Every structure is written in C-alpha cells, then in structure tokens.
Design an enzyme around this catalytic site. Structure first.
Site, PDB file in Angstrom:
ATOM      1  CG  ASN A 112    -130.906  17.908-162.633  1.00 57.76           C
ATOM      2  OD1 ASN A 112    -129.804  17.354-162.585  1.00 57.76           O
ATOM      3  ND2 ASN A 112    -132.043  17.249-162.882  1.00 57.76           N
ATOM      4  CG  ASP A 149    -124.729  13.222-168.978  1.00 56.27           C
ATOM      5  OD1 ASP A 149    -123.852  13.152-169.883  1.00 56.27           O
ATOM      6  OD2 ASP A 149    -124.482  13.745-167.872  1.00 56.27           O
ATOM      7  CB  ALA A 163    -120.024   9.195-168.535  1.00 60.61           C
ATOM      8  CG  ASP A 182    -122.596  15.128-165.389  1.00 64.63           C
ATOM      9  OD1 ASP A 182    -121.957  14.687-166.382  1.00 64.63           O
ATOM     10  OD2 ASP A 182    -123.504  15.985-165.487  1.00 64.63           O
ATOM     11  CG  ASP A 231    -125.947  13.356-163.783  1.00 66.41           C
ATOM     12  OD1 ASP A 231    -126.349  14.511-163.480  1.00 66.41           O
ATOM     13  OD2 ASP A 231    -125.299  13.133-164.840  1.00 66.41           O
ATOM     14  CG  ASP A 275    -134.472  22.707-158.334  1.00 64.03           C
ATOM     15  OD1 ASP A 275    -135.181  22.543-157.342  1.00 64.03           O
ATOM     16  OD2 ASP A 275    -134.582  22.023-159.381  1.00 64.03           O
ATOM     17  CD  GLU A 309    -134.160  20.485-153.249  1.00 63.55           C
ATOM     18  OE1 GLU A 309    -134.141  20.895-154.462  1.00 63.55           O
ATOM     19  OE2 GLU A 309    -134.499  19.319-152.967  1.00 63.55           O
ATOM     20  N   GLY A 312    -146.388  13.415-128.431  1.00 62.34           N
ATOM     21  CA  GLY A 312    -145.685  13.459-127.143  1.00 62.34           C
ATOM     22  C   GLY A 312    -144.624  12.391-126.976  1.00 62.34           C
ATOM     23  CE1 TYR A 355    -138.053  12.781-132.907  1.00 61.61           C
ATOM     24  CE2 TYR A 355    -137.737  14.857-131.766  1.00 61.61           C
ATOM     25  CZ  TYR A 355    -137.329  13.945-132.710  1.00 61.61           C
ATOM     26  OH  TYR A 355    -136.204  14.171-133.488  1.00 61.61           O
ATOM     27  CG  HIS A 398    -139.493  12.220-123.424  1.00 69.87           C
ATOM     28  ND1 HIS A 398    -140.751  12.072-123.989  1.00 69.87           N
ATOM     29  CD2 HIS A 398    -138.707  11.268-123.991  1.00 69.87           C
ATOM     30  CE1 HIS A 398    -140.719  11.078-124.864  1.00 69.87           C
ATOM     31  NE2 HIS A 398    -139.491  10.578-124.890  1.00 69.87           N
TER      32      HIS A 398
HETATM   33 CA   LIG Z   1    -128.221  15.812-163.292  1.00 68.89          CA
HETATM   34 CA   LIG Z   2    -122.036  13.580-168.420  1.00 65.91          CA
HETATM   35 NA    NA Z   3    -141.906  14.253-126.041  1.00 61.97          NA
HETATM   36 NA    NA Z   4    -125.718  14.992-166.230  1.00 63.48          NA
END
Ligand SMILES: [Ca+2]
Ligand SMILES: [Ca+2]
Ligand code: NA
Ligand code: NA
Ligand SMILES: OC[C@H]1O[C@H](O[C@H]2[C@H](O)[C@@H](O)[C@@H](O)O[C@@H]2CO)[C@H](O)[C@@H](O)[C@@H]1O
Length: 481
Positions: free
Chosen positions: A102, A159, A179, A181, A192, A229, A259, A298, A300, A404
């Site tokens: 990135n 960028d 700009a 991406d 971005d 990543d 990810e 409990g 949930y 439950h």
């Molecule tokens: Ca980026």
């Molecule tokens: Ca760009």
């Molecule tokens: Na539960």
């Molecule tokens: Na970028």
C-alpha cells in the site's frame, strides 16, 4: 488432509532477532499438530529494527543490508528465514509471505513537493490551495545500492503523504497532479490513503515494479503463497493483476488471502467480485460475531453464527480466524475474543467443514504487550481442537443451531480417515445436553470428549444418535475412543 493455517507472529513479540530461529525450531511441533501452512510476518526492512513489518521501507532487504540502523529485521536475517522455510517445507508446511504494498515508510530523504490538503473524513474534498511541503518520499537504499534492483522511488511514485516536515504537521496531503486510486474502499469518501507515503497505482512504472518485486520475493523465499496487507486501500484491479502476474511467472498455485478489513459481507463480496474470485479473504464478520458472543455473557443469539459471514456464503474463499495482530489487546482494530469464549470459537473454525481456518500465534503462546489484558497462552486448550480437526473432522456435517445458547454440529467421519467422526457442542450460556446424529455407520461406538471438559462416555445408538453434554460457557468435542 484438512488444511490448517497459522499466523506465525503477534504484535508485541520481543525485538531480539530470534523469531526466524524460533519458527525453524517449532516446525516439528507445527507439523505434528496438523498445521499445513504458516503466514509469516513481513520479512523486509521496516522503518527501524523494531518495526513489526508494515512500515515497508525496502522490499528487497530481507534482513540482508545495513539500513535503518540494523542488518536483521525484527525477526532475524534473510538466511535465518530461508533456513526456517526449508525446515517447514521439509515437513510439508507451506509458507505464505506477507505483502505490504500500500505504502512505503521511512524514506531516506525529503523532497519539496507541491500538494493540497484533503479532508480526512472525505478525501475527495480538497481543503487548501497548493502549498509547498517537505515529504518523506526519496528512497535511495544506501545500504543496498542496486543489488537485486536499481529502482529508486521519488514523490511522483506516490499519491500523497501524512506529514509535512517543514511545518512539522500531520495532515493528509495529495500531491500535485495526483489522484487517489480507484477502485478502493469508499469509506472516508475514498480510502486509498492510509499512512506513510501512499503508492500511486496509476503509475505504469510502479505497477511494473511491484509485479516484478512480487516474483522476486516469491523466488527468494520459495513462497507457496501470499497474505495481502491492507487491501481496502489498494486499487482492486491492480491486486487482481498482481496475483495473476506472480502465478504466471512462478508457474505455481500461490494461494493468496487478502486482509480486507470491514465488518460487512457486502463489501467483501464486492472485493471478491472485483478481483474475479482469484483469491480468498479473511472472514472479518465471523471474527466480530465471536467478539460479540464473547462480550455479551450469554445474551448473544448463537444461531447468528451461521449468517452474514464470508464462510456462510463463499466457503472456498474464506480464511476463518478468531483473533490476529490487529485485533489483539492494545492494537488498532482491537476487538479481542475474550479468553473464556476463545476455545469455542476455535472449535467453530477448526471442526466445521467450511472455510480455511487459521490459528493465531498470540492465542497459542500468549501476547507480550505491556498491559494486564494480554491474551494468555491457550495452546493446551487449542491442541485438542487441532487434533479433532486433523484426525476426526471429516465426512458429512449436520448442524444444530436450534437454541439461543447451546449449539452444535456433527461430522459423520470418512472411510479414508480411520475412526474419524465428531460431535461438537458450544454454549455461551448455561450447559446442558443435545441429541445429535453422527451417522448410522457409527452405531455402537463409544465416544469421549477430546477436550477433557466432560468426563462422560457416549454410546452411539442403533439409529446413529448420541446424547451429548456440554458444561456452562464451554466446549465439548466427542470422538471415538
Ligand atoms: Ca493506497
Ligand atoms: Ca493515483
Ligand atoms: Na446466547
Ligand atoms: Na494511491
Ligand atoms: O493448507 C495447505 C493447502 O491450502 C490451500 O487449500 C485451501 C483452499 O485453497 C481453500 O479454498 C479452502 O477450501 O481450504 C483449503 C485448505 O483446507 C491450497 O489451495 C492447497 O493447495 C494447500 O495444500
């Protein structure tokens, strides 16, 4: 035969340069317990020796060159990593390398750059006129020189950045003529920009370079695959093309998991669609359900676990997990699955038929932050569940998400794995019993709880049913004695 991934690091491991040696020495243990792949932390030089690896200063320096005050990375030298990888391959354990493309952090020098500020909540909105900033954008790699790659980075490969050195100010700056991406996450208008110097994937020299680095990295570490990543900040069509390119050049499958951090099945499905389903994603929604169940005492509704997850809709493309280096205590996406619930969550990912499950180093061995909220070592509670996956979790599945609190599932076993078959129960509340079908082919067998949580035996009746028990807030996984 069942594949099991392990994320082989956590955020707060000591910076002693021994991690690769540790991995090498753990390979026998990993193989014996049925781990078939490991995701290793980023292996290249960060902004300092103690960088966890997401700084990404020099992608061609795998702890080989004296740069950023050290030869080794946090984890060790290139040679140590390569020795760990050959030990893992000797036991048929695949290695997935972490790919941080990135951004680049820790530039060697600043450059004067014309830029405008953008709104951090809406990066499409410009909030200044043009100004002159000093951005950390010049990468010369003095310690490496041209060894492996003569590519140098300058401001025009990016960028923008989040730091002007002249005014000593932390703002999001978009460089003149650049700009953001697309396509990327639409969060904050356009997501971005994340941190450090953001790579411009509109630049044809950059796309070519990152693709050729990808191939180099795969060869250099004999990688079997990749973990991508921060993909919601990286042009989706580029990631698609990068994965295809490296597969084409290496001639290998190169299993890849991305990810994409969002608790939203819809967004993850969009990403999958925009990358032509050529790689998997982590099951982030499932993680958030585990976190919710673990914090609601409990309250949930455990039936919810079957919906709104990647694994529920695209099981072949889901890597399921409980926690990771971002969700662990103290970290940037903190949403830790509480200790008491953690083994129940591991049973869900490890013993069910759908998804590629991943175990977290921090859960196995504990996390080593400075808090009193660290994850304790849960290796001894997870080991039996791993054994259940490795030896017992085969054949037709039957679900019992009909309550439950107390939910369960069975696996009938497969004749290709001797004595396979299991019956699992988890409960986020009071314990109790559930009758479940394990297959008429298991009639008359005597089954016992491999976790040791329950001491009672269960004899499967002529019709293939057993009466199984679970304790309060607990897990039991019955298998043939
Ligand atoms: Ca980026
Ligand atoms: Ca760009
Ligand atoms: Na539960
Ligand atoms: Na970028
Ligand atoms: O663990 C080694 C194993 O990983 C991959 O298999 C995945 C598969 O790609 C996923 O679609 C999912 O269904 O889980 C599988 C593992 O249980 C590789 O594709 C495979 O070659 C490799 O042996």
């Amino acid at each position: 035969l069942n594949g099991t991934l392990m994320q082989y690091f956590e955020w707060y491991m000591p910076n002693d340069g021994q991690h690769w040696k540790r991995l090498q020495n753990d390979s026998a243990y990993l193989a014996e317990h049925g781990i078939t792949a490991v995701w290793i932390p980023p292996a290249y030089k960060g902004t300092s020796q103690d960088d966890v690896g997401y700084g990404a200063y020099d992608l061609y320096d795998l702890g080989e060159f004296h740069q950023k005050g050290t030869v080794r990375t946090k984890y060790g030298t290139k040679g140590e990593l390569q020795s760990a990888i050959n030990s893992l391959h000797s036991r048929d354990i695949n290695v997935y390398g972490d790919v941080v493309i990135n951004h680049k952090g820790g530039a060697d020098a600043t450059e004067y750059v014309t830029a405008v500020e953008v709104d951090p909540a809406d990066r499409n909105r410009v909030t200044s006129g043009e100004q002159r900033i000093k951005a950390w954008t010049h990468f010369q790699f003095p310690g490496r020189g041209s060894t492996y790659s003569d590519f140098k980075w300058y401001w025009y490969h990016f960028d923008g950045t989040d730091w002007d050195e002249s005014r000593k100010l932390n703002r999001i700056y978009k460089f003149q003529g650049k700009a953001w991406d697309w396509e990327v996450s639409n969060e904050n208008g356009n997501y971005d920009y994340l941190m450090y110097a953001d790579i411009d994937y509109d630049h044809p020299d950059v796309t070519a370079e990152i693709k050729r680095w990808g191939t180099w990295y795969a060869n250099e570490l004999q990688l079997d695959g990749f973990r991508l990543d921060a993909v919601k900040h990286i042009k989706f069509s580029f990631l698609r093309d990068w994965v295809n390119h490296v597969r084409e050049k290496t001639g290998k499958e190169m299993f890849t998991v991305a990810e994409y951090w969002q608790n939203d099945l819809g967004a993850l499905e969009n990403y999958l669609n925009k990358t032509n389903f050529n790689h998997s994603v982590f099951d982030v929604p499932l993680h958030y359900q585990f976190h919710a169940a673990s914090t609601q005492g409990g309250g949930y509704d455990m039936r919810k676990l079957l919906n709104g997850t990647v694994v529920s809709k695209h099981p072949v493309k889901a890597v399921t997990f409980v926690d990771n280096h971002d969700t662990q205590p103290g970290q940037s996406l903190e949403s830790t699955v509480q200790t008491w619930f953690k083994p129940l969550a591991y049973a869900f990912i490890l013993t069910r038929e759908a998804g590629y499950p991943q175990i977290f180093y921090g859960d196995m061995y504990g996390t080593k932050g400075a808090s009193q909220r660290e994850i304790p070592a849960l290796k001894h509670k997870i080991e039996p569940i791993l054994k259940a996956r490795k030896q017992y979790a085969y054949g037709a599945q039957h679900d019992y998400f009909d309550h439950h609190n107390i939910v369960g599932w069975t696996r009938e076993g497969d004749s290709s794995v001797a004595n396979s078959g299991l019956a699992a129960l988890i409960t986020d509340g009071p314990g109790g019993t559930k009758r479940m079908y394990v297959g008429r082919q298991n009639a008359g067998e005597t089954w016992h709880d491999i976790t040791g949580n329950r001491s009672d035996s269960v004899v499967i009746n002529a019709e293939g049913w057993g009466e199984f028990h679970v304790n309060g807030g607990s897990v039991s996984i019955y298998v043939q004695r």
